[PDB]
Design a protein around this ligand. Structure first.
Ligand code: HEM
Ligand SMILES: CCCCc1nc(Cl)c(CO)n1Cc1ccc(-c2ccccc2-c2nn[nH]n2)cc1
Length: 461
Protein backbone atom coordinates (compact mmCIF):
# COMPACT_ATOMS: atom_id res chain seq x y z
CA UNK A 1 0.00 0.00 0.00
CA UNK A 2 1.27 3.71 0.47
CA UNK A 3 5.04 3.89 0.05
CA UNK A 4 7.50 4.02 2.99
CA UNK A 5 8.14 7.25 4.90
CA UNK A 6 8.78 8.73 8.34
CA UNK A 7 5.88 8.07 10.74
CA UNK A 8 3.84 11.29 11.09
CA UNK A 9 2.91 12.71 14.54
CA UNK A 10 -0.83 12.93 14.97
CA UNK A 11 -1.86 16.53 14.14
CA UNK A 12 1.33 18.30 13.02
CA UNK A 13 2.17 15.41 10.59
CA UNK A 14 5.79 15.18 9.46
CA UNK A 15 6.38 18.92 9.91
CA UNK A 16 9.35 18.38 12.25
CA UNK A 17 11.43 16.32 9.72
CA UNK A 18 10.55 18.31 6.58
CA UNK A 19 10.53 21.67 8.35
CA UNK A 20 9.37 24.98 6.85
CA UNK A 21 12.30 27.11 5.61
CA UNK A 22 13.50 24.72 2.81
CA UNK A 23 11.26 21.98 1.52
CA UNK A 24 13.26 20.78 -1.45
CA UNK A 25 16.48 20.17 0.54
CA UNK A 26 14.57 18.20 3.15
CA UNK A 27 12.87 16.18 0.42
CA UNK A 28 16.36 15.49 -0.95
CA UNK A 29 17.53 14.38 2.54
CA UNK A 30 14.62 12.13 3.30
CA UNK A 31 15.11 10.49 -0.13
CA UNK A 32 18.60 9.41 1.05
CA UNK A 33 16.87 7.06 3.52
CA UNK A 34 13.37 6.21 2.28
CA UNK A 35 14.61 6.19 -1.34
CA UNK A 36 13.26 7.32 -4.73
CA UNK A 37 9.62 7.15 -3.67
CA UNK A 38 8.18 7.93 -0.25
CA UNK A 39 5.28 9.44 1.68
CA UNK A 40 5.00 12.61 3.74
CA UNK A 41 2.13 14.04 5.75
CA UNK A 42 1.32 17.66 5.43
CA UNK A 43 -0.88 17.53 8.54
CA UNK A 44 -3.37 14.80 7.56
CA UNK A 45 -2.72 14.88 3.80
CA UNK A 46 -0.50 12.08 2.45
CA UNK A 47 1.81 13.27 -0.32
CA UNK A 48 3.73 10.73 -2.34
CA UNK A 49 7.09 12.25 -3.31
CA UNK A 50 9.06 11.24 -6.43
CA UNK A 51 12.83 11.78 -6.56
CA UNK A 52 15.05 10.25 -9.27
CA UNK A 53 14.87 11.09 -12.99
CA UNK A 54 14.00 7.36 -13.30
CA UNK A 55 11.11 7.75 -10.77
CA UNK A 56 9.91 11.08 -12.21
CA UNK A 57 10.05 9.86 -15.84
CA UNK A 58 8.29 6.56 -15.13
CA UNK A 59 5.49 8.45 -13.37
CA UNK A 60 4.92 11.41 -15.78
CA UNK A 61 5.88 10.09 -19.23
CA UNK A 62 5.17 6.34 -18.78
CA UNK A 63 2.07 6.46 -16.48
CA UNK A 64 1.36 9.93 -17.91
CA UNK A 65 -2.44 9.80 -17.86
CA UNK A 66 -2.57 8.32 -14.32
CA UNK A 67 -0.32 11.13 -13.00
CA UNK A 68 -1.86 13.97 -15.11
CA UNK A 69 -4.15 15.34 -12.37
CA UNK A 70 -3.53 18.55 -10.46
CA UNK A 71 -3.02 18.28 -6.72
CA UNK A 72 -4.72 21.12 -4.96
CA UNK A 73 -3.19 22.49 -1.85
CA UNK A 74 -5.71 24.72 -0.13
CA UNK A 75 -4.89 28.35 -0.84
CA UNK A 76 -5.71 27.58 -4.48
CA UNK A 77 -9.04 26.07 -3.31
CA UNK A 78 -10.02 29.43 -1.64
CA UNK A 79 -8.44 31.66 -4.35
CA UNK A 80 -11.21 30.09 -6.44
CA UNK A 81 -9.09 29.19 -9.48
CA UNK A 82 -10.34 25.76 -10.53
CA UNK A 83 -11.81 26.68 -13.93
CA UNK A 84 -9.38 27.16 -16.81
CA UNK A 85 -5.93 25.52 -17.04
CA UNK A 86 -3.49 25.51 -14.09
CA UNK A 87 -5.75 24.39 -11.29
CA UNK A 88 -8.41 22.47 -13.17
CA UNK A 89 -8.97 18.80 -13.49
CA UNK A 90 -10.28 16.03 -15.63
CA UNK A 91 -12.46 16.88 -18.67
CA UNK A 92 -12.50 20.64 -18.15
CA UNK A 93 -8.72 20.48 -18.00
CA UNK A 94 -8.27 18.56 -21.29
CA UNK A 95 -10.87 20.53 -23.25
CA UNK A 96 -9.44 23.95 -22.27
CA UNK A 97 -5.84 22.87 -22.37
CA UNK A 98 -6.15 21.56 -25.97
CA UNK A 99 -8.05 24.69 -27.03
CA UNK A 100 -5.62 27.08 -25.33
CA UNK A 101 -2.66 25.20 -26.85
CA UNK A 102 -4.38 25.19 -30.30
CA UNK A 103 -5.08 28.96 -30.24
CA UNK A 104 -1.48 29.79 -29.14
CA UNK A 105 -0.06 27.64 -31.96
CA UNK A 106 -1.18 30.71 -34.05
CA UNK A 107 -1.44 34.54 -33.61
CA UNK A 108 -3.30 36.66 -36.35
CA UNK A 109 -0.68 37.27 -39.13
CA UNK A 110 2.26 38.95 -37.17
CA UNK A 111 3.85 35.78 -35.79
CA UNK A 112 4.53 35.38 -32.03
CA UNK A 113 8.27 35.75 -32.90
CA UNK A 114 7.54 39.12 -34.48
CA UNK A 115 5.59 40.03 -31.31
CA UNK A 116 8.50 39.10 -29.02
CA UNK A 117 11.30 40.58 -31.15
CA UNK A 118 9.47 43.93 -31.26
CA UNK A 119 9.06 43.81 -27.48
CA UNK A 120 12.84 43.25 -27.16
CA UNK A 121 13.33 46.50 -29.10
CA UNK A 122 11.07 48.34 -26.57
CA UNK A 123 12.95 46.81 -23.66
CA UNK A 124 16.24 47.98 -25.19
CA UNK A 125 14.72 51.49 -25.56
CA UNK A 126 13.93 51.53 -21.78
CA UNK A 127 17.28 50.20 -20.73
CA UNK A 128 18.46 53.20 -22.79
CA UNK A 129 16.24 55.58 -20.76
CA UNK A 130 18.02 54.57 -17.48
CA UNK A 131 20.96 56.66 -18.84
CA UNK A 132 23.34 54.03 -17.42
CA UNK A 133 22.62 55.06 -13.81
CA UNK A 134 22.31 52.00 -11.60
CA UNK A 135 18.80 50.39 -11.32
CA UNK A 136 16.78 47.48 -9.99
CA UNK A 137 15.81 45.65 -13.17
CA UNK A 138 12.65 44.16 -11.54
CA UNK A 139 9.87 46.26 -13.14
CA UNK A 140 11.60 46.73 -16.53
CA UNK A 141 12.39 43.02 -16.89
CA UNK A 142 8.81 42.15 -15.86
CA UNK A 143 7.17 44.48 -18.35
CA UNK A 144 8.77 42.77 -21.38
CA UNK A 145 7.11 39.33 -20.80
CA UNK A 146 3.91 40.97 -19.46
CA UNK A 147 3.58 42.89 -22.72
CA UNK A 148 4.14 39.82 -24.84
CA UNK A 149 1.39 38.11 -22.81
CA UNK A 150 -1.04 41.01 -22.84
CA UNK A 151 -0.70 41.13 -26.64
CA UNK A 152 -1.68 37.50 -26.95
CA UNK A 153 -4.56 37.59 -24.33
CA UNK A 154 -6.30 40.90 -25.20
CA UNK A 155 -4.15 42.79 -27.74
CA UNK A 156 -3.29 45.86 -25.64
CA UNK A 157 0.22 46.73 -24.43
CA UNK A 158 1.40 48.65 -21.33
CA UNK A 159 3.71 51.65 -21.29
CA UNK A 160 6.72 50.39 -19.25
CA UNK A 161 6.09 52.86 -16.37
CA UNK A 162 2.26 52.71 -16.57
CA UNK A 163 1.07 52.90 -12.95
CA UNK A 164 -1.50 50.11 -13.65
CA UNK A 165 1.16 47.63 -14.87
CA UNK A 166 3.25 48.55 -11.84
CA UNK A 167 0.50 47.35 -9.45
CA UNK A 168 -0.12 44.14 -11.30
CA UNK A 169 3.63 43.46 -11.43
CA UNK A 170 4.41 43.93 -7.75
CA UNK A 171 1.18 42.08 -6.81
CA UNK A 172 2.36 39.13 -8.94
CA UNK A 173 5.80 39.57 -7.38
CA UNK A 174 4.38 39.73 -3.86
CA UNK A 175 2.21 36.65 -4.39
CA UNK A 176 5.16 34.47 -5.41
CA UNK A 177 7.12 35.83 -2.39
CA UNK A 178 4.27 34.82 -0.09
CA UNK A 179 3.74 31.40 -1.67
CA UNK A 180 7.42 30.65 -0.87
CA UNK A 181 7.24 32.13 2.69
CA UNK A 182 7.73 29.80 5.68
CA UNK A 183 4.32 31.04 6.97
CA UNK A 184 2.60 29.62 3.91
CA UNK A 185 4.39 26.37 4.62
CA UNK A 186 2.70 26.42 8.06
CA UNK A 187 -0.63 27.18 6.32
CA UNK A 188 -0.30 23.83 4.49
CA UNK A 189 0.38 21.69 7.54
CA UNK A 190 -2.81 23.31 9.09
CA UNK A 191 -5.51 24.20 6.50
CA UNK A 192 -7.89 25.64 9.24
CA UNK A 193 -5.36 28.45 10.04
CA UNK A 194 -5.98 29.83 6.52
CA UNK A 195 -9.48 30.77 7.52
CA UNK A 196 -8.99 32.03 11.08
CA UNK A 197 -5.56 33.68 11.50
CA UNK A 198 -4.15 37.12 10.43
CA UNK A 199 -1.23 36.77 7.97
CA UNK A 200 0.18 36.98 4.51
CA UNK A 201 -2.14 34.30 3.19
CA UNK A 202 -4.97 36.88 3.41
CA UNK A 203 -3.18 39.41 1.23
CA UNK A 204 -2.25 36.86 -1.38
CA UNK A 205 -5.98 36.19 -1.67
CA UNK A 206 -6.76 39.92 -2.00
CA UNK A 207 -4.18 40.33 -4.79
CA UNK A 208 -5.45 37.27 -6.60
CA UNK A 209 -8.97 38.69 -6.47
CA UNK A 210 -7.66 41.96 -7.90
CA UNK A 211 -6.07 40.45 -11.06
CA UNK A 212 -9.23 38.29 -11.42
CA UNK A 213 -11.34 41.43 -11.37
CA UNK A 214 -8.98 43.31 -13.76
CA UNK A 215 -9.07 40.46 -16.30
CA UNK A 216 -12.87 40.36 -16.04
CA UNK A 217 -13.05 44.04 -17.05
CA UNK A 218 -11.08 43.11 -20.20
CA UNK A 219 -13.28 40.05 -20.84
CA UNK A 220 -16.62 41.89 -20.48
CA UNK A 221 -15.46 44.71 -22.79
CA UNK A 222 -14.29 42.06 -25.40
CA UNK A 223 -17.83 40.51 -25.49
CA UNK A 224 -19.29 43.79 -26.90
CA UNK A 225 -16.69 44.78 -29.49
CA UNK A 226 -17.28 41.22 -30.66
CA UNK A 227 -17.62 40.60 -34.41
CA UNK A 228 -17.61 36.91 -35.22
CA UNK A 229 -16.23 37.49 -38.67
CA UNK A 230 -13.21 38.98 -36.94
CA UNK A 231 -11.39 38.06 -33.76
CA UNK A 232 -7.83 39.25 -32.99
CA UNK A 233 -6.57 37.69 -29.72
CA UNK A 234 -7.02 34.82 -27.22
CA UNK A 235 -10.06 36.26 -25.39
CA UNK A 236 -11.89 36.70 -28.76
CA UNK A 237 -11.07 33.15 -29.95
CA UNK A 238 -12.43 31.83 -26.65
CA UNK A 239 -15.73 33.73 -27.04
CA UNK A 240 -16.02 32.32 -30.58
CA UNK A 241 -15.67 28.78 -29.17
CA UNK A 242 -18.41 29.74 -26.63
CA UNK A 243 -20.78 30.38 -29.59
CA UNK A 244 -19.59 27.23 -31.57
CA UNK A 245 -20.88 25.43 -28.43
CA UNK A 246 -24.71 25.26 -28.08
CA UNK A 247 -24.63 21.71 -29.37
CA UNK A 248 -22.59 20.91 -26.28
CA UNK A 249 -25.12 23.09 -24.32
CA UNK A 250 -23.89 22.18 -20.77
CA UNK A 251 -20.81 24.56 -20.90
CA UNK A 252 -17.19 23.27 -20.72
CA UNK A 253 -16.36 26.80 -21.97
CA UNK A 254 -18.04 29.27 -19.51
CA UNK A 255 -16.99 32.95 -19.10
CA UNK A 256 -15.89 31.72 -15.67
CA UNK A 257 -13.42 29.32 -17.35
CA UNK A 258 -12.28 32.11 -19.74
CA UNK A 259 -11.90 34.58 -16.86
CA UNK A 260 -9.67 31.94 -15.17
CA UNK A 261 -7.67 30.66 -18.16
CA UNK A 262 -6.82 34.26 -19.03
CA UNK A 263 -5.56 34.92 -15.49
CA UNK A 264 -3.59 31.58 -15.42
CA UNK A 265 -1.73 32.56 -18.59
CA UNK A 266 -1.26 36.20 -17.59
CA UNK A 267 0.25 35.38 -14.21
CA UNK A 268 2.28 32.29 -15.14
CA UNK A 269 3.59 33.95 -18.38
CA UNK A 270 4.61 37.22 -16.75
CA UNK A 271 6.04 36.19 -13.39
CA UNK A 272 7.97 33.03 -14.27
CA UNK A 273 9.79 34.50 -17.32
CA UNK A 274 10.23 37.78 -15.43
CA UNK A 275 11.83 35.97 -12.45
CA UNK A 276 14.02 33.87 -14.81
CA UNK A 277 15.43 36.97 -16.61
CA UNK A 278 16.09 38.80 -13.43
CA UNK A 279 18.27 35.92 -12.11
CA UNK A 280 19.94 35.47 -15.49
CA UNK A 281 21.25 39.01 -15.37
CA UNK A 282 22.16 38.34 -11.72
CA UNK A 283 24.20 35.30 -12.82
CA UNK A 284 25.80 37.22 -15.67
CA UNK A 285 27.01 39.98 -13.23
CA UNK A 286 28.53 37.24 -11.12
CA UNK A 287 30.42 35.57 -14.06
CA UNK A 288 31.82 38.11 -16.48
CA UNK A 289 34.12 35.47 -18.09
CA UNK A 290 30.80 33.89 -19.34
CA UNK A 291 29.07 37.18 -20.19
CA UNK A 292 32.03 37.96 -22.50
CA UNK A 293 32.07 34.57 -24.34
CA UNK A 294 28.32 35.21 -24.94
CA UNK A 295 28.82 38.76 -26.21
CA UNK A 296 31.51 37.48 -28.57
CA UNK A 297 29.00 35.08 -30.20
CA UNK A 298 26.38 37.76 -30.44
CA UNK A 299 28.78 40.18 -32.20
CA UNK A 300 30.11 37.43 -34.41
CA UNK A 301 26.72 35.92 -35.51
CA UNK A 302 24.09 38.62 -35.08
CA UNK A 303 25.53 42.09 -35.66
CA UNK A 304 25.17 44.97 -33.35
CA UNK A 305 22.43 46.05 -35.67
CA UNK A 306 19.56 43.75 -36.56
CA UNK A 307 17.20 42.13 -34.03
CA UNK A 308 18.26 38.64 -32.99
CA UNK A 309 15.93 35.89 -34.29
CA UNK A 310 15.24 32.27 -33.26
CA UNK A 311 17.10 30.98 -36.32
CA UNK A 312 20.27 32.47 -34.65
CA UNK A 313 20.18 30.04 -31.75
CA UNK A 314 21.43 27.04 -33.71
CA UNK A 315 24.59 29.03 -34.66
CA UNK A 316 25.19 30.15 -31.05
CA UNK A 317 25.83 27.07 -28.94
CA UNK A 318 27.49 29.04 -26.10
CA UNK A 319 24.54 31.37 -25.68
CA UNK A 320 22.16 28.41 -26.02
CA UNK A 321 24.02 26.63 -23.15
CA UNK A 322 24.20 29.67 -20.91
CA UNK A 323 20.38 30.08 -21.27
CA UNK A 324 19.90 26.41 -20.40
CA UNK A 325 22.33 26.60 -17.52
CA UNK A 326 20.49 29.56 -15.96
CA UNK A 327 17.28 27.54 -15.94
CA UNK A 328 18.92 24.43 -14.58
CA UNK A 329 20.97 26.11 -11.93
CA UNK A 330 18.26 28.47 -10.66
CA UNK A 331 15.72 25.64 -10.44
CA UNK A 332 12.77 28.02 -10.60
CA UNK A 333 10.03 25.71 -9.31
CA UNK A 334 11.92 23.07 -7.22
CA UNK A 335 8.94 20.84 -6.81
CA UNK A 336 6.97 21.88 -9.96
CA UNK A 337 3.27 22.37 -9.23
CA UNK A 338 1.85 19.41 -7.25
CA UNK A 339 0.25 16.57 -9.26
CA UNK A 340 -2.44 14.09 -8.20
CA UNK A 341 -3.35 10.59 -9.41
CA UNK A 342 -6.47 10.37 -11.49
CA UNK A 343 -7.45 6.74 -10.76
CA UNK A 344 -5.95 4.20 -8.30
CA UNK A 345 -2.58 3.14 -9.67
CA UNK A 346 -0.10 0.43 -8.73
CA UNK A 347 3.30 2.07 -9.20
CA UNK A 348 6.74 0.63 -8.27
CA UNK A 349 4.78 -2.13 -6.41
CA UNK A 350 2.90 0.31 -4.09
CA UNK A 351 -0.70 1.16 -5.08
CA UNK A 352 -1.63 4.81 -4.47
CA UNK A 353 -5.32 5.76 -4.25
CA UNK A 354 -7.23 8.11 -6.58
CA UNK A 355 -6.70 11.68 -5.34
CA UNK A 356 -3.33 11.17 -3.62
CA UNK A 357 -1.23 14.28 -4.21
CA UNK A 358 2.21 13.81 -5.81
CA UNK A 359 5.34 15.95 -5.67
CA UNK A 360 7.87 15.83 -8.43
CA UNK A 361 11.23 16.90 -7.20
CA UNK A 362 12.43 18.67 -10.32
CA UNK A 363 15.55 19.76 -8.43
CA UNK A 364 16.40 16.09 -8.09
CA UNK A 365 16.50 15.93 -11.95
CA UNK A 366 17.92 19.32 -12.91
CA UNK A 367 20.67 18.90 -10.23
CA UNK A 368 21.44 15.23 -10.93
CA UNK A 369 25.09 14.49 -10.23
CA UNK A 370 25.81 11.89 -12.97
CA UNK A 371 24.11 13.88 -15.74
CA UNK A 372 25.52 17.15 -14.40
CA UNK A 373 28.88 16.94 -12.61
CA UNK A 374 29.02 19.49 -9.78
CA UNK A 375 25.37 20.43 -10.17
CA UNK A 376 25.58 23.25 -7.62
CA UNK A 377 28.16 25.07 -9.83
CA UNK A 378 26.82 27.41 -12.56
CA UNK A 379 28.88 26.08 -15.50
CA UNK A 380 27.67 26.45 -19.14
CA UNK A 381 29.78 23.41 -20.06
CA UNK A 382 27.06 21.34 -18.41
CA UNK A 383 25.25 21.80 -21.78
CA UNK A 384 28.27 21.66 -24.25
CA UNK A 385 30.08 18.63 -25.73
CA UNK A 386 33.90 18.49 -25.80
CA UNK A 387 33.77 19.95 -29.26
CA UNK A 388 32.07 23.08 -28.07
CA UNK A 389 28.76 22.13 -29.54
CA UNK A 390 25.43 22.18 -27.72
CA UNK A 391 24.51 18.86 -26.11
CA UNK A 392 20.80 18.42 -25.30
CA UNK A 393 19.86 16.48 -22.08
CA UNK A 394 16.94 14.18 -21.06
CA UNK A 395 17.52 15.64 -17.56
CA UNK A 396 16.76 19.27 -18.54
CA UNK A 397 13.13 19.52 -17.60
CA UNK A 398 12.48 22.95 -15.93
CA UNK A 399 9.11 23.06 -17.71
CA UNK A 400 8.26 19.63 -16.20
CA UNK A 401 7.24 16.77 -18.43
CA UNK A 402 4.30 14.59 -19.37
CA UNK A 403 0.73 15.52 -20.07
CA UNK A 404 0.88 18.70 -17.86
CA UNK A 405 4.14 20.13 -19.21
CA UNK A 406 4.39 23.92 -19.45
CA UNK A 407 1.76 25.20 -21.92
CA UNK A 408 4.15 28.06 -22.70
CA UNK A 409 7.39 26.05 -23.02
CA UNK A 410 8.14 27.43 -26.47
CA UNK A 411 7.02 31.04 -25.95
CA UNK A 412 9.27 31.23 -22.91
CA UNK A 413 12.13 29.60 -24.76
CA UNK A 414 11.89 32.57 -27.21
CA UNK A 415 11.30 35.36 -24.63
CA UNK A 416 14.55 34.36 -22.81
CA UNK A 417 16.83 33.97 -25.78
CA UNK A 418 15.61 37.09 -27.58
CA UNK A 419 15.42 39.41 -24.56
CA UNK A 420 18.84 38.34 -23.21
CA UNK A 421 20.71 38.55 -26.53
CA UNK A 422 18.95 41.85 -27.24
CA UNK A 423 20.21 43.22 -23.90
CA UNK A 424 23.76 41.90 -24.34
CA UNK A 425 24.23 43.08 -27.95
CA UNK A 426 23.39 46.67 -26.80
CA UNK A 427 24.68 46.82 -23.25
CA UNK A 428 27.49 46.00 -20.93
CA UNK A 429 26.35 45.05 -17.48
CA UNK A 430 28.06 46.90 -14.67
CA UNK A 431 27.47 45.35 -11.29
CA UNK A 432 27.59 47.99 -8.53
CA UNK A 433 28.92 45.39 -6.10
CA UNK A 434 32.09 43.30 -6.57
CA UNK A 435 31.12 39.95 -8.24
CA UNK A 436 33.33 38.22 -5.63
CA UNK A 437 30.77 39.52 -3.14
CA UNK A 438 27.17 39.26 -4.32
CA UNK A 439 25.38 36.05 -3.50
CA UNK A 440 23.00 34.47 -5.98
CA UNK A 441 21.06 32.48 -3.45
CA UNK A 442 17.31 32.40 -3.46
CA UNK A 443 16.05 34.51 -0.60
CA UNK A 444 13.15 31.96 -0.25
CA UNK A 445 12.13 28.75 -2.20
CA UNK A 446 8.71 27.21 -1.05
CA UNK A 447 6.95 27.45 -4.41
CA UNK A 448 9.59 29.22 -6.36
CA UNK A 449 13.28 30.03 -6.06
CA UNK A 450 12.95 33.87 -5.97
CA UNK A 451 16.26 35.79 -6.40
CA UNK A 452 17.97 38.38 -4.06
CA UNK A 453 17.97 42.13 -4.42
CA UNK A 454 20.60 43.48 -6.77
CA UNK A 455 21.27 46.47 -8.96
CA UNK A 456 23.26 47.01 -12.08
CA UNK A 457 24.15 49.57 -14.70
CA UNK A 458 23.27 49.19 -18.36
CA UNK A 459 26.19 50.89 -20.07
CA UNK A 460 25.81 50.93 -23.90
CA UNK A 461 28.48 49.82 -26.33
C1 HEM B 1 10.73 30.08 -17.56
C2 HEM B 1 9.46 30.17 -17.87
C3 HEM B 1 8.56 29.14 -17.40
C4 HEM B 1 8.80 28.12 -16.58
C5 HEM B 1 10.09 27.80 -15.92
C6 HEM B 1 7.59 27.42 -16.46
C7 HEM B 1 7.50 26.29 -15.66
C8 HEM B 1 6.31 25.66 -15.49
C9 HEM B 1 6.13 24.56 -14.67
C10 HEM B 1 7.16 23.87 -13.86
C11 HEM B 1 4.86 24.21 -14.74
C12 HEM B 1 4.29 23.07 -13.98
C13 HEM B 1 3.44 22.21 -14.87
C14 HEM B 1 3.25 20.93 -14.15
O1 HEM B 1 4.23 20.23 -13.90
O2 HEM B 1 2.13 20.57 -13.78
C15 HEM B 1 4.21 25.09 -15.60
C16 HEM B 1 2.89 25.04 -15.89
C17 HEM B 1 2.34 26.01 -16.69
N1 HEM B 1 2.93 26.99 -17.34
FE1 HEM B 1 4.70 27.35 -17.35
N2 HEM B 1 6.65 27.98 -17.19
C18 HEM B 1 7.17 29.03 -17.78
C19 HEM B 1 6.63 29.95 -18.64
C20 HEM B 1 5.31 29.91 -18.94
C21 HEM B 1 4.71 30.76 -19.84
C22 HEM B 1 5.34 31.84 -20.64
C23 HEM B 1 3.42 30.43 -19.88
C24 HEM B 1 2.47 31.11 -20.72
C25 HEM B 1 1.22 30.71 -20.69
C26 HEM B 1 3.23 29.36 -18.99
C27 HEM B 1 2.05 28.76 -18.77
C28 HEM B 1 1.98 27.65 -17.96
C29 HEM B 1 0.69 27.06 -17.69
C30 HEM B 1 -0.63 27.51 -18.21
C31 HEM B 1 0.92 26.04 -16.91
C32 HEM B 1 -0.12 25.11 -16.37
C33 HEM B 1 0.27 23.72 -16.82
C34 HEM B 1 -0.91 22.83 -16.96
O3 HEM B 1 -1.71 22.72 -16.05
O4 HEM B 1 -1.10 22.18 -17.98
N3 HEM B 1 4.41 29.05 -18.44
N4 HEM B 1 5.12 26.00 -16.04
C1 LIG C 1 -2.22 29.70 -4.99
C2 LIG C 1 -2.78 31.10 -5.09
C3 LIG C 1 -3.85 31.23 -6.16
C4 LIG C 1 -3.32 31.06 -7.58
C5 LIG C 1 -2.99 32.35 -8.25
N1 LIG C 1 -3.90 33.15 -8.81
C6 LIG C 1 -3.20 34.20 -9.30
CL1 LIG C 1 -3.98 35.49 -10.12
C7 LIG C 1 -1.87 34.06 -9.05
C8 LIG C 1 -0.71 34.93 -9.38
O1 LIG C 1 -0.19 35.61 -8.25
N2 LIG C 1 -1.73 32.87 -8.37
C9 LIG C 1 -0.49 32.28 -7.88
C10 LIG C 1 0.26 31.50 -8.94
C11 LIG C 1 1.58 31.12 -8.73
C12 LIG C 1 2.26 30.40 -9.70
C13 LIG C 1 1.66 30.05 -10.90
C14 LIG C 1 2.40 29.28 -11.94
C15 LIG C 1 1.77 28.19 -12.55
C16 LIG C 1 2.40 27.44 -13.52
C17 LIG C 1 3.68 27.76 -13.91
C18 LIG C 1 4.34 28.83 -13.33
C19 LIG C 1 3.71 29.60 -12.35
C20 LIG C 1 4.44 30.74 -11.75
N3 LIG C 1 4.10 32.01 -11.90
N4 LIG C 1 5.01 32.67 -11.20
N5 LIG C 1 5.88 31.86 -10.63
N6 LIG C 1 5.54 30.63 -10.97
C21 LIG C 1 0.34 30.44 -11.10
C22 LIG C 1 -0.35 31.16 -10.13
Amino acid sequence: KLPPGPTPLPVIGNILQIGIKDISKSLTNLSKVYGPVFTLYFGLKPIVVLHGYEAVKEALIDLGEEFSGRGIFPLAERANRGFGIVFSNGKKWKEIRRFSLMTLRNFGMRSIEDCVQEEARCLVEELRKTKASPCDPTFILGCAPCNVICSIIFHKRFDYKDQQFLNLMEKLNENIKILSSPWIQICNNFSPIIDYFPGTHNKLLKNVAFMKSYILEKVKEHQESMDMNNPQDFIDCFLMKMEKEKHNQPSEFTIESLENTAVDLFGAGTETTSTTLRYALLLLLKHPEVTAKVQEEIERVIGRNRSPCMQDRSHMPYTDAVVHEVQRYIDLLPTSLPHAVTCDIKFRNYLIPKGTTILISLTSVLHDNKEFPNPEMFDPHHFLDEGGNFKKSKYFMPFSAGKRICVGEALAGMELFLFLTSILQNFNLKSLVDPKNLDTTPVVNGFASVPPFYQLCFIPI
